[PDB]
């Protein structure tokens, strides 16, 4: 039950995906639509007024940031413009587990997959990525760190 988003500068999602553990075998039935953009839209609000200041030396990674009344969110800000958001958590428990360093070895690790696709000179900014390979790569890159 994990939900990835890359959300752009003018609020566009350049890459957004879910996946599920087969131990859950589905994901957030009837909660999968409120845990989407509106929560993430407010997450854009809090990283909008959290990036530009020094202080709430690792300016990119930020860890767990906020919490609605069912789960809690994490974040990452790149200087490319983009703001990576993973949304994780089994829906039964309040999932506390922020690994905070091994999933820090996801955000700097998915960053180059965004880099090499950005370096495609046919690829513009403010348009999403239907790579058939880079989206099959990231779930297997999430097979490293569940």
């Amino acid at each position: 039950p994990q939900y990835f988003a890359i959300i752009g500068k003018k609020d566009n999602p350049v890459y957004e995906i879910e996946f599920t553990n087969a131990e859950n075998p589905q994901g957030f039935p009837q909660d999968l639509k409120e845990l989407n953009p509106f929560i993430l839209h407010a997450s854009l609000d809090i990283v909008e007024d959290l990036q530009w200041q020094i202080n709430p030396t690792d300016n990119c990674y930020l860890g767990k940031v906020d919490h609605f009344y069912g789960l809690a969110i994490t974040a990452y800000i790149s200087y490319s413009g983009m703001k990576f958001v993973m949304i994780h958590g089994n829906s039964a428990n309040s999932s506390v587990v922020i690994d905070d360093n091994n999933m820090r070895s996801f955000y700097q690790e998915v960053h180059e997959l965004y880099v090499k696709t950005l370096m495609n000179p046919f690829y513009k900014i403010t348009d999403p990525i239907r790579s058939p390979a880079f989206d099959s790569r990231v779930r297997t890159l999430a097979r490293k760190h569940l």
Binding site: F38, L44, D49, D66, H67, F68, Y69
Partner: protein, 215 residues
Amino acid sequence: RSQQKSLGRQMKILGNFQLLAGRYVDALNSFVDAITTLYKVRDYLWLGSALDGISICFLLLSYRNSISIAAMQSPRNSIMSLSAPALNIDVENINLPLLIKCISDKVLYYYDLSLMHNSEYAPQVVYCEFLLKTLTFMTSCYKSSEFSKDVLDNIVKNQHRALSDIPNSPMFPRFEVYFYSNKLFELQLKEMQVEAQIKIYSTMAEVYRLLGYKR
């Protein structure tokens, strides 16, 4: 405990009665019918302050857990109203600061600081209302909620300190822990009454639109 209950009901009723019946609108001051109040132009809740001081002292000596935060609500309303608006630099809150020393949240000497401190104190006392299991305000005695009074408690908190962070940062600023300290609706909030939900979401939306946090 019967003396504690008798003093609790009498002190809560007397605190609210002499609060609302002193300086309700005192800019013309019709001095006839001076039975229940002084009611002159210099009558701004002074006997209400003395009565609320004795009421909070007897409430702390009563030792409630549910109704006892209304004493802190009475003292906080006293130090807000009669020591902010029609104060005229009197601010007679010596036994209020003594109750702040006794029960909770002493050691403050400013506007918008001791009010926040006593609001945290009354919130902690209403958190210490673990299980009253009775009916006190008898509008509802079987289908009622401690949720339905606690949402009014912290929205009194939210309206009375969220405006102090002026949208224009330079004027009167503090840290933006208003959203951080606003995420406190862990309760269920599934339709006790629809107008409570409407005023709670109107104020919760309006403060985010005030602080420029649109999303």
